[PDB]
Amino acid sequence: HYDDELFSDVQDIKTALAKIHEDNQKIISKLESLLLLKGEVESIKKQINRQNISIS
Amino acid sequence: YDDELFSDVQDIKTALAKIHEDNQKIISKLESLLLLKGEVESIKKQINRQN
Amino acid sequence: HYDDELFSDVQDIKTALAKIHEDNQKIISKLESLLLLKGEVESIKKQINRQNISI
Amino acid sequence: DELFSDVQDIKTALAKIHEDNQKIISKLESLLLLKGEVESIKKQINRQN
């Protein structure tokens, strides 16, 4: 059959998987947030290149 | 193979599959983020020349 | 009922999930630490625009 | 029998996830080094001012 302790173990696996999934959704959105650094860093690089055009 | 156990196992399978795919998405986003190292290194270099 | 070897397999599965959960917590805090880069990068941008008004 | 096969596939999937996790942590540790670097850049921008 479906033994009670096996059942219990399965429930805890369910809980843990569910925690893992939601943590992954946090991970992903933090990453989406961090990826915005690429353009910003690119802008700094661009500004530093206009700045280095300082024939003074 | 109890039907309910069976159902539970399939649900675990779905969750694992989803987790795995999220992992590949995370890795790729990370591979992209890693390109920042060279860019930041480059800015540092430009800033030192600028000095 | 709950067969000995299935039982052994379930415990190993439990061990792996625990480890995975843990690595996730460490991953999350590393990410929270990296997110501070946003403000810092923003400051740099600002202090460089300030510099550009060098004329 | 079929449950056995399912458990093996779960074990496979778990191992893969775990290993991606080690690759993720390592990429992250490398990314963490960016903290000192932009701190330096920040410092050299202040000195430039």
XYZ file of C-alpha atoms in Angstrom:
211
model
C 0.000 0.000 0.000
C 1.048 3.588 0.713
C 2.799 3.192 4.062
C 2.208 5.976 6.606
C 5.869 6.820 7.203
C 6.657 6.706 3.497
C 3.674 8.994 3.050
C 5.130 11.292 5.691
C 8.513 11.267 3.973
C 6.877 12.108 0.649
C 5.112 15.105 2.245
C 8.406 16.468 3.527
C 9.948 16.016 0.080
C 7.016 18.033 -1.264
C 7.667 20.818 1.274
C 11.356 20.942 0.469
C 10.817 20.970 -3.309
C 8.326 23.781 -2.850
C 10.874 25.818 -0.862
C 13.490 25.125 -3.482
C 11.241 26.342 -6.287
C 10.337 29.642 -4.595
C 13.971 30.320 -3.726
C 14.760 29.818 -7.392
C 12.200 32.483 -8.267
C 13.941 34.859 -5.834
C 17.313 33.943 -7.384
C 16.034 34.632 -10.905
C 14.638 38.098 -10.148
C 17.758 39.142 -8.223
C 19.663 38.111 -11.340
C 17.317 40.083 -13.602
C 18.072 43.005 -11.319
C 21.834 42.431 -11.436
C 21.896 42.085 -15.232
C 20.927 45.745 -15.487
C 24.532 46.406 -14.438
C 25.742 45.469 -17.947
C 24.250 48.580 -19.557
C 25.216 50.821 -16.653
C 28.777 49.548 -16.732
C 28.710 50.076 -20.484
C 27.559 53.688 -19.894
C 30.425 54.344 -17.497
C 32.843 52.933 -20.083
C 31.277 55.270 -22.645
C 31.491 58.280 -20.337
C 35.084 57.562 -19.468
C 35.870 57.490 -23.178
C 34.252 60.894 -23.768
C 36.082 62.123 -20.675
C 39.452 60.886 -21.928
C 38.758 63.138 -24.864
C 40.220 65.938 -22.771
C 42.791 67.556 -25.043
C 43.465 70.175 -22.359
C 2.643 1.073 -7.077
C -0.151 2.733 -5.104
C -2.068 5.204 -7.253
C -1.684 8.081 -4.777
C 2.034 7.448 -4.302
C 2.200 7.336 -8.072
C 0.505 10.729 -8.317
C 2.867 12.167 -5.714
C 5.883 10.847 -7.601
C 4.710 12.483 -10.842
C 4.310 15.772 -9.023
C 7.841 15.472 -7.664
C 9.010 14.782 -11.222
C 7.345 17.985 -12.483
C 8.897 20.055 -9.693
C 12.354 18.597 -10.343
C 12.022 19.318 -14.071
C 11.060 22.925 -13.320
C 13.895 23.342 -10.859
C 16.414 22.018 -13.371
C 15.261 24.416 -16.092
C 15.405 27.358 -13.682
C 18.976 26.264 -12.978
C 19.937 26.533 -16.668
C 18.342 29.967 -16.818
C 20.294 30.998 -13.716
C 23.580 29.653 -15.132
C 23.138 31.529 -18.406
C 22.251 34.777 -16.642
C 25.355 34.217 -14.521
C 27.584 33.529 -17.589
C 26.371 36.884 -18.882
C 26.999 38.655 -15.578
C 30.557 37.322 -15.567
C 31.384 39.463 -18.588
C 31.236 42.368 -16.119
C 34.672 41.376 -14.813
C 36.492 42.317 -18.020
C 34.414 45.466 -18.419
C 35.166 46.595 -14.874
C 38.799 45.673 -15.372
C 38.713 47.805 -18.529
C 37.186 50.789 -16.729
C 39.915 50.506 -14.087
C 42.506 50.583 -16.869
C 40.931 53.610 -18.528
C 40.737 55.370 -15.169
C 44.442 54.735 -14.575
C 45.350 56.120 -18.001
C 43.077 59.098 -17.334
C 45.182 59.805 -14.224
C 5.183 -1.986 3.422
C 7.924 0.634 3.336
C 10.632 -1.527 1.756
C 14.119 -1.269 3.276
C 15.854 -0.245 0.058
C 13.155 2.189 -0.988
C 13.612 3.550 2.534
C 17.348 3.902 1.960
C 16.706 5.675 -1.331
C 14.267 8.043 0.356
C 16.883 9.036 2.989
C 19.455 9.780 0.339
C 16.871 11.885 -1.450
C 16.309 13.738 1.826
C 20.046 14.316 2.190
C 20.332 15.795 -1.298
C 17.315 18.133 -0.813
C 18.791 19.429 2.451
C 22.113 20.162 0.745
C 20.313 21.802 -2.169
C 18.226 23.954 0.166
C 21.429 25.009 1.957
C 23.321 25.976 -1.170
C 20.246 28.013 -2.100
C 20.514 30.008 1.149
C 24.198 30.684 0.486
C 23.423 31.590 -3.127
C 20.709 34.032 -1.941
C 22.995 35.932 0.432
C 25.798 36.160 -2.140
C 23.210 37.661 -4.514
C 22.042 40.136 -1.838
C 25.662 41.129 -1.449
C 26.116 41.576 -5.201
C 22.956 43.723 -5.439
C 24.805 46.431 -3.469
C 26.780 46.873 -6.715
C 23.754 48.699 -8.158
C 24.051 51.692 -5.832
C 27.828 51.749 -6.142
C 27.723 51.600 -9.930
C 25.121 54.377 -9.775
C 27.414 56.529 -7.604
C 30.310 56.034 -9.992
C 28.105 57.104 -12.887
C 27.113 60.198 -10.904
C 30.613 61.120 -9.810
C 31.759 60.714 -13.421
C 29.030 63.006 -14.731
C 30.104 65.428 -12.020
C 33.668 65.122 -13.323
C 32.541 65.689 -16.906
C 31.453 69.167 -15.793
C 35.183 69.861 -15.590
C 35.092 72.880 -17.894
C 9.682 -2.006 -10.251
C 8.340 1.085 -12.004
C 8.533 2.993 -8.731
C 12.154 1.887 -8.551
C 12.763 3.361 -12.005
C 11.067 6.609 -11.004
C 13.224 6.879 -7.884
C 16.340 6.402 -10.004
C 15.286 9.221 -12.310
C 14.681 11.481 -9.289
C 18.134 10.616 -7.989
C 19.553 11.493 -11.388
C 17.735 14.819 -11.429
C 18.877 15.576 -7.833
C 22.540 14.955 -8.663
C 22.319 17.237 -11.697
C 20.733 19.984 -9.668
C 23.348 19.675 -6.938
C 26.136 19.967 -9.493
C 24.615 23.017 -11.165
C 24.476 24.450 -7.649
C 28.262 24.035 -7.237
C 28.812 25.725 -10.593
C 26.455 28.543 -9.546
C 28.233 29.129 -6.221
C 31.628 29.250 -7.931
C 30.438 31.724 -10.586
C 28.989 33.770 -7.710
C 32.272 33.801 -5.745
C 33.982 35.084 -8.842
C 31.313 37.766 -9.277
C 31.778 38.767 -5.614
C 35.288 40.000 -6.465
C 33.546 42.802 -8.344
C 32.849 44.416 -4.964
C 36.469 45.391 -4.287
C 36.963 46.368 -7.909
C 34.155 48.918 -8.118
C 35.236 50.080 -4.681
C 38.703 50.729 -6.173
C 37.215 52.472 -9.191
C 35.151 54.586 -6.801
C 38.350 55.391 -4.916
C 40.306 56.351 -8.006
C 37.390 58.500 -9.158
C 37.471 60.399 -5.848
C 41.227 60.896 -6.112
C 40.682 62.187 -9.665
C 38.129 64.772 -8.494
